[PDB]
Design a protein around this nucleic acid. Structure first.
Ligand code: K
Ligand code: K
Ligand code: K
Ligand code: K
Ligand code: K
Ligand code: K
Ligand code: K
Ligand code: K
Ligand code: K
Ligand code: K
Ligand code: K
Ligand code: K
Ligand code: K
Ligand code: MG
Ligand code: MG
Ligand code: MG
Ligand code: MG
Ligand code: MG
Ligand code: MG
Ligand code: MG
Ligand code: MG
Ligand code: MG
Lengths: 148, 59, 56, 314, 38, 178
RNA sequence: CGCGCCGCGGCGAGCCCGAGGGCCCCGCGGCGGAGCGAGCGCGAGACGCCCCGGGCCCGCCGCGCCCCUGCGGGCGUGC
């Protein structure tokens, strides 16, 4: 709303906050980003390291759905099991009726190892594992599995 | 003494009598209490504030 | 035309207006620049003290 | 508690349970925020023409001819400036102004629910402007079931006690005060009751009445519930409308009504109660302040400091 | 209350202190400008 | 004239009232401000100041952080002037009593299903206005992503990342990269 | 219209009147949720009302030692 703005509080002041000595002119520094290596060098080095130059290999066309790679940690695995069933599985730490969790159905590929699991056997099927995700899973009685 | 000799040209000073001290307090005496300037008019206010140091009346 | 080259006339008054700041209390104890052979032995000693050790 | 239900003639005929949408907290801040954004979404754009002021040919004469430097038409007439007669605006209005505003779906449902809860108070409906001094219940439910002649529909509104609110609206029609009467907004009337209906034909017999509006219960409008952005409208529910309120809120998928809270009536009660009062402990006695005055003036003033009298009075 | 009793008693105790200290201090002030003289 | 400049500093501005238009916040703050003036307890004084804060100074608290902090003192009332969310990475919750400004719908369901209680600040006001057997708690005020870019990336003692995308090398490969 | 910061509202490990279809109803992306590395790729729990610092863990660069499926795995050390 125009009626609550700072600029309407300057009616009657000859110069709307821009000063008498300097004033308000068109483009006293130039337009846009120009000057970054000469007269704005003090600005560009203080706040934008690595703005100038080249770095690394280039790919003329990236395949966005090849490089896509979702991930899930082991501390998030038991929340994929619906709440109505988690209690019973913990109740009976079965080796012969352990829960099977296939994480690609939920849309993940690799399993990483942050966190910890409850003391309960469980089977996890995925496309790739990290080394300590496997280590913490075998510590619990679980098995990792690879799936198509 | 050595600080006061630095600001001599701003100040004048000397030794007061017990008559000078009495008139200043009885006539121009106000007290600082919680940062406020409070008229000193009776012994009730010197006792409440300074009784820990065994000053109880104006004298 | 020529303009003034240099003065420090008002600069001690600007330096004093917000007080003269002091460095952070934790800069006096920064490990930066101490001998590495002393900083290695410092970590080793604490890790094997049950009153100080923070291993799980 | 149960709401009462009246026949199309005025006696008590039935009882229905309170729908849960009336227990939502009253939020005049949320109703004002939503009413503001959704009343901006009905606007029609306006703008000046893009050629206006720039169809003529004009150029500066320059210095040396004893005249100001603005562009001039052949002959010397001022042109092409905001300070010249016939020139363009300094910054012309454009239709790319953002005319609409966005509101989340959760906050749109809160505003309807808070505006409906305000309608269940006889003290907020009165303070909104309506005349409800001769009304059986302010959650007013009435059994009509089919109304086609305006004459019969006028008879019900009398048979209950909302007759004075529609005459309040009828006798108020007038020509408005400004330029608005050249722009198809020539008359103004005050706003009366809102009839909300579900399965019965009532619209034909109610619509012609001054200051009356019609809402099918499945789609309730916030600009109707809070005219002027003031919440408490008087609402005449048909029986089938009032008895489908909970079904309607069950039809909103993965939605729960907001949590009920306490009022300043409830807070003022707690503080005046023995569980809170028993923690109270009094302040010290406060300093006593007089004005200065010369003790030496009199015997009594001086005696206040020194009682003995060693000190001379004067 | 008990506040009005203590404030009643206290001032009384302070007042009799004011008549004790006045006379002694008047005695002291006369005695200084004597001892120097001797 | 009077010289009131030397040895004297400029006065300070702090929030002495909430600036929310929510009527439930004004009612509670005005109520706890009253209890402080008739009690002098410093629990009701810190709690009165928490209710004036600006929602970036009131971060959330998760159940797993509370379960961790309240361990070994599980018979006490946690008091939080913010929202309590849920942490699904914790499989089992303990029984506790929490009083908060707001609970998530899923956090309320879990707290109650363990035997716990979800109090409101007006339940707290009625039963325990001066904070007996209560602990005051808060979340990590410096957890926001915005507060991770404050400063001068590019200066040799910064440890802060820049803001946009920077595709070059100059000044970005360590010292002696300019 | 784009960028930064601050305030307030709603919901919260989630969030969301795209376009479209039947002021009401239904409605994908996306952004957030993990980072680091030029890249092959590998991938975080240990403490803490809050803030500041310390310690430790992940990636990139280096290097003892032991081993199975081996220029691959494990366990360490240092800026
Ligand atoms: K300015
Ligand atoms: K200037
Ligand atoms: K220029
Ligand atoms: K320019
Ligand atoms: K540049
Ligand atoms: K290159
Ligand atoms: K033209
Ligand atoms: K001119
Ligand atoms: K001119
Ligand atoms: K929403
Ligand atoms: K709405
Ligand atoms: K930057
Ligand atoms: K590398
Ligand atoms: Mg001025
Ligand atoms: Mg002028
Ligand atoms: Mg300038
Ligand atoms: Mg100049
Ligand atoms: Mg000028
Ligand atoms: Mg300074
Ligand atoms: Mg001209
Ligand atoms: Mg014109
Ligand atoms: Mg006029």
């Amino acid at each position: 709303p125009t009626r609550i703005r700072k600029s309407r509080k300057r009616r009657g002041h000859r110069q709307m906050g821009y000063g008498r000595v300097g004033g308000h002119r068109k483009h006293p520094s130039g337009r846009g980003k120009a000057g970054g290596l000469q007269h704005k060098r003090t600005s560009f080095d203080k706040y934008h390291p690595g703005y100038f130059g080249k770095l690394g290999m280039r790919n003329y066309h990236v395949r966005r759905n090849i490089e896509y790679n979702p991930t899930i940690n082991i501390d998030k695995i038991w929340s994929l099991i619906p709440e109505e069933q988690r209690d019973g599985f913990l109740q009976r730490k079965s080796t012969t009726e352990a829960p099977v969790v296939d994480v690609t159905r939920f849309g993940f590929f690799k399993v990483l190892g942050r966190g910890s699991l409850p003391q309960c056997p469980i089977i996890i099927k995925a496309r790739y594992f990290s080394s300590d995700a496997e280590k913490k899973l075998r510590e619990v009685g679980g098995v990792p599995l690879l799936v198509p | 003494l050595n600080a006061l000799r630095i600001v001599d040209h701003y100040v004048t000073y000397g030794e007061p009598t017990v008559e000078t001290i009495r008139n200043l307090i009885y006539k121009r005496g106000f007290a600082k209490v919680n940062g406020q300037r409070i008229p000193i008019v009776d012994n009730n206010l010197i006792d409440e504030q300074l009784s820990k140091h065994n000053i109880l009346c104006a004298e | 035309a020529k303009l003034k080259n240099h003065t420090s006339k008002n600069q001690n008054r600007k330096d004093h207006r917000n007080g003269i700041k002091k460095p952070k209390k934790s800069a006096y104890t920064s490990h930066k620049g101490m001998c590495p052979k002393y900083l290695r032995n410092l970590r080793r000693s604490r890790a094997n003290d049950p009153r100080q050790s923070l291993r799980p | 508690p149960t709401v009462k239900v009246f026949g199309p003639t005025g006696t008590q005929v039935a009882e229905l349970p309170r729908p849960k949408v009336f227990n939502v907290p009253l939020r005049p801040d949320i109703i004002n925020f939503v009413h503001t954004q959704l009343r901006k979404c009905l606007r029609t754009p306006y703008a000046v023409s893009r050629y206006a002021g720039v169809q003529c040919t004009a150029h500066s004469w320059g210095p040396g001819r004893a005249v100001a430097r603005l562009p001039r038409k052949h002959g010397g007439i001022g042109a092409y400036a905001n300070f010249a007669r016939g020139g363009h605006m300094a910054h012309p209005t454009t239709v790319i102004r953002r005319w609409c505003r966005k509101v989340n779906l959760n906050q749109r449902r809160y505003a309807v629910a808070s505006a409906l809860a305000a309608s269940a108070n006889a003290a907020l409906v009165e303070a909104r402007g309506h005349r409800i001094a001769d009304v059986p219940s302010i959650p007013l439910v009435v059994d009509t079931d089919n109304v086609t002649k305006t004459k019969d529909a006028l008879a019900i509104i009398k048979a209950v006690g909302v007759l004075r609110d529609v005459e309040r609206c009828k006798d108020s029609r007038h020509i408005r005060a400004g330029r608005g009467k050249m722009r198809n907004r020539r008359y103004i009337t005050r706003k009366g009751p809102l009839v909300i209906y579900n399965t019965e034909d009532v619209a034909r017999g109610f619509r012609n009445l001054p200051g009356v509006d019609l809402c099918h219960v499945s789609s309730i409008r916030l600009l109707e519930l809070a005219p002027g952005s003031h919440p408490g409208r008087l609402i005449l529910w048909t029986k089938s409308a009032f008895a489908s309120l909970d079904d309607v809120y069950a039809a909103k998928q993965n939605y729960t009504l907001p949590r009920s809270c306490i009022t300043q009536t409830d807070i003022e009660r707690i503080l005046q109660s023995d569980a809170v009062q028993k923690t109270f402990v009094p302040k010290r006695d406060p300093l006593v302040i007089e004005r200065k005055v010369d003790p030496f003036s009199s015997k009594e003033a001086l005696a206040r400091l020194d009682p003995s009298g060693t000190v001379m009075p004067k | 209350a008990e506040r009005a009793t203590e404030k009643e008693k206290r001032a009384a105790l302070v007042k009799d202190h004011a008549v004790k200290s006045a006379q002694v201090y008047a005695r002291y002030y006369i005695d200084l400008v004597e001892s120097e003289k001797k | 004239g009077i010289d009131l400049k030397t040895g004297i500093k400029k006065r300070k501005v702090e929030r002495k009232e909430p600036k929310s238009p929510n009527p439930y916040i004004r009612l509670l703050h005005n109520a706890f401000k009253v209890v402080y003036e008739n009690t002098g307890e410093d629990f009701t004084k810190v709690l009165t100041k928490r209710l004036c804060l600006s929602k970036t100074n009131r971060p959330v608290l998760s159940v797993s952080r509370l379960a961790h902090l309240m361990h070994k003192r599980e018979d006490k009332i946690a008091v939080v002037a913010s929202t309590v969310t849920n942490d699904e990475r914790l499989v089992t919750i303990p029984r506790m009593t929490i009083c908060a400004l707001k609970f998530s719908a899923t956090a309320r369901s879990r707290i109650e299903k363990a035997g716990g209680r979800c109090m409101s600040f007006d339940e707290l006001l009625a039963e325990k206005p001066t904070g007996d057997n209560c602990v005051l708690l808060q979340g990590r005020r410096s957890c926001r992503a915005v507060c991770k870019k404050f400063g001068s990336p590019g200066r040799p003692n910064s440890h802060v990342k820049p803001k946009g995308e920077h595709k070059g090398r100059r000044g970005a490969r360590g010292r002696h990269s300019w």
